[PDB]
Amino acid sequence: SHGGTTRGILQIRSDQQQSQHALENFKREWKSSLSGINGSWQIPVVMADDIKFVNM
Amino acid sequence: VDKRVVASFTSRELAMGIRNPRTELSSSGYGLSEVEIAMKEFIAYNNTESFNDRFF
Per-residue buried b or exposed e for B34-49, using 16+ beta carbons within 10 Å of the residue's own CB: eeeeeeeeeeeeeeee
| Shortest Cα–Cα distance, A2 to chain B (Å) | 24
Q: Which residues pair with A53 in a beta bridge?
A: A10
Which runs of E-coded beta strand occur in A1-56? 8-13, 50-55
For chain B, report the end-to-end CA distance as a whole number of angstroms: 42
| Chain A residues with beta carbon closer than 8 angstroms to that of B54 | 37, 40-41
What is the C-alpha separation between B21 and B25, in angstroms, rounded?
Answer: 11
Contacts of A41 in chain B (CB under 8 A): 54-55
Distances (CA, A) of B14 to A43, B2, B8, B19: 58, 20, 9, 17
**Resolution of the coordinates, Å:** 3.6
For residue A41, which of B2, B56, B42 has the smallest C-alpha distance?
B56
